[PDB]
């Protein structure tokens, strides 16, 4: 028989499964739409979340009753040292989706980025991109023809960049490497920009400016195995419940004779990848600035 | 009943050239040119004497021979639209709030802008199809004129303008406001 009183469902069925993310670096599943009239620019940046603080600002909302009045606001600070461009990759469009056609790297890779290709850096011969550096140092032969392949094909161009983890107070030493899409100019202009920016750094004020709405993509804080009461927000059972009260009382009807995928159960809470949109930049601060 | 042969006649005036390969009809006259795809209707065309064109259907049923007269009417509408043209006059009808109709340019796309319909703050914009020209007629109060070669384009633009001014949440027998097409004719009427 029907549910005696209606209540909305506990939790969102679109954030399933509530499993641990595959990597600690959340993926950018979509980049901004390209128009080939603006200059060549990165569509994204990498940083490290440092903490939060408060600000006071005068509100400009013509019609609010806090118009032209001070409000205090919570802000979060992302430490963003300038990122290093090492590499470009091109993507052809196929009837099975986007496919990377080739990748062209810079000649010199720093130690902090080539620590990313190792699990045991201290016992290594450090042989990584040595034959690639040998593929360099000719006139242009092995690099210019692959860049020409990217020009001839590859409707989408992405640039491989890596963080300067040594400039942060973190104890990691192993840089984070990511692909960032370029959304200006033709394909030849994009790959020319990438070639010109090999082994070179890009600062965050070249990508972002003040009063800009941006999105934050990150893996949330982990919490391990969690019960249903805090994982899903279900009602606590009454005090005189035998065999525990932090549970869901009925996990399904007799028919169908299976527990449903939509029923709330205990499991991993946190360490899920999330994309949160519409965060206004309040300050683009400079490190070389008291 | 499977009528074994039915046919209709299209008369072609002096300045008119009709070219029909497979079922793509192109008519060229003094006012311009018009084209139409009729590959959905399955008829046959035959030129008789450079002023007459027969269109026929063989072994057809009731719906098929209905479509035959429909295609004859469509083709000669194209012919009379490229000779005389088509002109639809619409009138503004209002009780209290005067309807203000002008022509604006959003990205050079030639819009018709209707303001103050029943005193509301919403601004209604209807786009103008290509080949349709709009003039606000002097010496007649509150009259807009849409002219062109394609009767389908002219009538659909006039219908779009009429449908953009529909009254909501009111008795439309009392609130008779709108822009209504009052005359359909030709640019070179009584030639």
């Amino acid at each position: 028989s029907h549910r005696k009183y209606e209540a909305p469902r506990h939790g969102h069925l679109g954030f399933l499964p509530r499993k641990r993310a595959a990597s600690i670096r959340a993926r950018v599943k979509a980049f901004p739409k390209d128009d080939r009239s603006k200059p060549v620019a990165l569509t994204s940046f990498l940083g490290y979340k440092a903490g939060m603080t408060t600000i006071v600002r005068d509100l400009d909302r013509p019609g609010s009753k806090f118009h032209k009045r001070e409000v205090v606001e919570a802000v979060t600070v992302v430490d963003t040292p300038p990122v290093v461009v090492v590499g470009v990759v091109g993507y052809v469009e196929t009837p099975r989706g986007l496919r990377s056609l080739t990748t062209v790297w810079a000649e010199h890779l720093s130690d902090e980025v080539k620590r990313r290709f190792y699990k045991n850096w201290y016992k290594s011969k450090k042989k990584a991109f040595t034959k690639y550096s040998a593929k360099y140092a000719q006139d242009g032969a092995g690099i210019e023809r692959e860049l020409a392949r990217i020009k001839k094909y590859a409707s989408v161009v992405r640039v491989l960049v890596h963080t300067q983890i040594r400039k942060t107070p973190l104890a990691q030493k192993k840089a984070h490497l990511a692909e960032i899409q370029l959304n200006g100019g033709s394909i030849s202009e994009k790959v020319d920009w990438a070639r010109e920016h090999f082994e070179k750094t890009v600062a965050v004020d070249s990508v972002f400016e003040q009063n800009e709405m941006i999105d934050a993509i990150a893996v949330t804080k982990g919490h391990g195995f969690e019960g249903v009461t805090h994982r899903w927000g279900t009602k606590k059972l009454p005090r005189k419940t035998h065999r525990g009260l932090r549970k869901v009382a009925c996990i399904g009807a007799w028919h169908p004779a299976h527990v449903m995928w939509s029923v709330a159960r205990a499991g991993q809470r946190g360490y899920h990848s999330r994309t949160s949109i519409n965060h206004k930049i309040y300050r683009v601060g400079k490190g070389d600035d008291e | 009943m499977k009528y074994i042969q039915t046919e209709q006649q299209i008369e072609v005036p002096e300045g008119v050239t009709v070219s029909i390969k497979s079922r793509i009809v192109k008519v060229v006259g003094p006012r311009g040119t018009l084209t139409k795809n009729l590959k959905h209707i399955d008829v046959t065309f035959t030129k008789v004497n450079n002023q007459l064109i027969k269109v026929a259907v063989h072994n057809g049923g009731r719906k098929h021979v209905a479509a035959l007269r429909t295609v004859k009417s469509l083709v000669d509408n194209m012919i009379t639209g490229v000779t005389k043209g088509y002109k639809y006059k619409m009138r503004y009808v209002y009780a209290h709030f005067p309807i203000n109709v002008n022509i604006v340019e959003k990205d050079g796309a030639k819009f018709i802008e209707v303001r103050n319909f029943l005193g509301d703050k919403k601004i209604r914009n209807v786009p103008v199809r290509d080949g349709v020209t709009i003039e606000f007629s002097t010496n007649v109060k509150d009259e807009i004129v849409l002219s062109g070669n394609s009767v389908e384009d002219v009538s659909q633009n006039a219908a779009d303008l009429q449908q953009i001014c529909r009254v909501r949440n009111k008795d439309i027998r009392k609130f008779l406001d709108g822009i209504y097409v009052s005359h359909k004719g030709f640019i070179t009427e009584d030639l």
């Binding site: - | 072609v12 050239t17 009709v18 070219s19 029909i20 497979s22 035959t46 064109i53």
Partner: protein, 136 residues
């Protein structure tokens, strides 16, 4: 200039139209349409080829491009006389449709020695043709 309408005319069924019988007791002979019975069947007569006067479904015949003059409902002697006067037998035999049919029959009637002979002759003609395809 003048109007251009693609005519697209094809092979009417009428009295005097020559048909090639596709299947049955005749199966490959020419007959003449003597009368139309309805949309799907006609009365035909093939007296020179030995086809009897009969009502037949139009799905059993193929309409040919040949037409001669018959009055409607003409009897077999009249059909024979008009057929021989219009001389549609050799008019049929001159077409490449009839030539293709005869070629198929000849190829099927070949023997093993004859297939060897056409191999040898084809090799000789191929030598001459490929030699000629080096001057242009």
């Amino acid at each position: 200039t003048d109007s251009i309408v693609k005519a697209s005319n094809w092979r009417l069924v009428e009295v005097g139209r020559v048909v090639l019988i596709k299947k049955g007791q005749s199966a490959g002979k020419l007959a003449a349409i003597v009368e139309i019975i309805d949309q799907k069947k006609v009365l035909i007569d093939g007296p020179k080829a030995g086809v009897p006067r009969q009502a037949i479904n139009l799905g059993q015949v193929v309409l040919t491009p040949l037409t001669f003059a018959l009055p409607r409902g003409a009897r077999t002697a009249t059909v024979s006389k008009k057929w021989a006067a219009a001389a549609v037998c050799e008019k049929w035999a001159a077409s490449s449709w009839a030539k293709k049919i005869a070629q198929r029959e000849r190829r099927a009637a070949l023997t093993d020695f004859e297939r060897f002979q056409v191999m040898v002759l084809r090799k000789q003609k191929r030598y001459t043709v490929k030699k000629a395809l080096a001057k242009a």
